[PDB]
């Protein structure tokens, strides 16, 4: 078979990390696809509901309150060794034992019996994970405190879905694991291809994995590379890549203008949002602490800064119809849990913003054009990120809108922030105190609960709010009462309304994705529910 050439659009170097628990970014998660997507276990239907037949099956027992995972008999690592029950449990240790440096702790994992006490070092094992046919068998039982309504769906976050190669990694010290060749350039994997070579920061050469249990691929090889935003269209014009994933909305018209490509589409499981920095993360106690001293402590300020943006004007000018101003944090793909009732910051309202600030005592100084409260000037730092050729223009455009409401906003270090640096800034405890506003974007988990973005114990709560109303909202969505979908829908609506009113974050955009595919390629798809794409693609 053929030799496929794929890229992911990224202005930052690739961060190869083959262990899901230690990898935070969508870029490498996507590039890992041919190798098993960081060793994902379960197949799903097009509604993300688990089905039988993947690398493993999962069975829920709601009476016992357990999940039982059965790995295929012939599931192997790419060195021919068996994938075992212990490999599945070891994924949990990579997140829960703090020595590995994971940023993926969350209150969802507290619902596994014994896992909280393992995470704090009070227990030396995870009591709720046991092995009915031993560590070297194929079966794992996970004991919960309670079932959660999302457990039928991949991405639920209450039980994990990947394996880690424990026998391969057991003599690498936890503190060294993320930077070891064994999780970066020289991993074991379980997918239809294995990474024969990895060039740090740049590329992966994939060849078939002869130990794969499933459909054997048609292709001889796949190369997967990063390509910059400024070089992407020319790469398609010159046929440098057969497929490019992750392309920005601003290039969509150029891409449709090209001869020799089919352009695929999907509803993006995505949200972008503006964050306010309101606290710090306490690593010892695994808790967000909302104690930062800032004008952003004033609810009226948070709301005003949201109302002053012109997100619809930006989307109309630049996005080629692919971005839609978001009304809430729950995107359209989760159609059962959205409501046209919910009003957010999708319409600019400069008059309301100015009124809110006047009402809150932030009085305009007519000499300077900026507002003040008891001598404090309303000045903030905006950690805007590098993007496409329009990113500087768009960030300055928001600064200009904020000046209209008497808020002085300046870029972090007078420039846009590189992506890998920004991720370090956001995740490294205890968090930084030198930014006020930033923009985040998420390739969301395929189940709509946002515990793993905002729960009190999660470092992924980048602005470090900790609010009883929000915490009760998040818990209500996943409660036993939410096993009635009527109740869960109302809980989702309340959460969306409460997040918009508290305005600790402001929803920005929903999106459609697109991927150009050279006409020589057959079998590529963006359809959800396609489980064997990498084995089906050919030239």
């Amino acid at each position: 078979g053929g030799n496929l050439k794929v890229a992911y659009q990224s202005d930052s170097p690739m961060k190869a990390q083959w262990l899901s628990g230690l990898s935070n970014d969508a870029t490498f998660a996507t590039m890992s696809g041919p190798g098993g997507g960081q060793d994902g276990l379960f197949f799903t239907d097009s509604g993300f509901k688990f089905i039988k037949g993947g690398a493993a099956d999962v069975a829920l027992d709601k009476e016992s309150k357990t999940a039982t995972i059965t790995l295929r008999k012939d599931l192997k690592w790419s060195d021919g060794s068996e994938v075992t029950a212990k490999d599945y449990e070891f994924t949990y240790e990579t997140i829960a034992n703090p020595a590995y440096g994971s940023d993926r702790w969350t209150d969802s994992l507290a619902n596994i019996v014994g896992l909280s006490d393992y995470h704090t070092g009070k227990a030396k094992t995870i009591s709720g994970i046991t092995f009915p046919d031993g560590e070297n068998g194929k079966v794992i039982k996970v004991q919960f405190k309670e079932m959660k309504p999302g457990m039928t769906q991949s991405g639920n976050g209450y039980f994990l879905e990947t394996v880690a190669p424990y026998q391969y990694l057991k003599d690498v010290a936890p503190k060294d694991l993320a930077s070891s060749p064994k999780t970066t350039t020289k991993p074991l994997v379980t997918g239809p291809f294995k990474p024969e070579n990895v060039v740090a920061g740049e590329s992966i050469k994939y060849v078939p994995n002869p130990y794969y249990w499933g459909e054997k691929p048609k292709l001889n090889s796949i190369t997967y590379e990063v390509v910059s935003t400024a070089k992407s269209v020319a790469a398609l014009s010159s046929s440098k890549y057969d497929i490019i994933n992750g392309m920005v909305s601003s290039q969509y018209k150029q891409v449709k203008n090209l001869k020799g490509y089919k352009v695929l589409g999907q509803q993006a499981m995505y949200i972008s949002l503006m964050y306010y920095n309101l606290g710090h993360y306490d690593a010892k106690n695994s808790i967000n602490v909302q104690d930062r001293k800032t004008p952003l402590q004033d609810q009226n300020v948070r709301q005003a800064i949201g109302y002053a943006r012109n997100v619809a004007e930006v989307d109309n000018k630049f996005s080629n119809g692919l971005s839609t101003p978001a009304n809430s944090l729950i995107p359209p793909i989760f159609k059962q849990f959205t409501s046209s009732s919910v009003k957010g910051y999708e319409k600019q309202d400069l008059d309301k913003a100015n009124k809110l600030l006047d009402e809150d005592g932030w009085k305009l100084n007519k000499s300077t054009g900026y507002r003040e409260k008891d001598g404090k000037e309303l000045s903030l730092v905006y950690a805007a990120r590098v993007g496409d050729a329009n990113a500087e223009t768009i960030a300055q455009n928001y600064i200009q809108q904020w000046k209209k409401i008497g808020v002085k906003v300046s870029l972090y270090n007078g420039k846009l922030m590189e992506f890998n640096s920004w991720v370090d800034h956001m995740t490294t405890p205890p968090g930084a105190n030198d930014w006020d506003i930033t923009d985040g974007s998420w390739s969301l988990a395929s189940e709509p609960s946002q515990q793993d973005l905002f729960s009190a114990a999660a470092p992924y709560n980048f602005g470090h709010f900790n609010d009883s109303e929000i915490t009760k909202d998040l818990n209500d969505i996943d409660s036993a009462k939410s096993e009635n979908p009527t109740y869960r829908k109302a809980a989702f609506v309340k959460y969306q309304e409460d997040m918009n009113k508290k305005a600790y974050v402001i929803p920005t955009n929903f999106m459609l994705n697109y991927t150009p595919v050279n006409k020589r390629v057959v079998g590529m798809t963006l359809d959800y529910g396609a489980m064997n794409t990498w084995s089906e693609i050919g030239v």
Binding site: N24, D25, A26
Partner: peptide
């Protein structure tokens, strides 16, 4: 399936 930080 998990939440991942996107560059755009």
């Amino acid at each position: 399936a998990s939440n991942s930080i996107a560059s755009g």
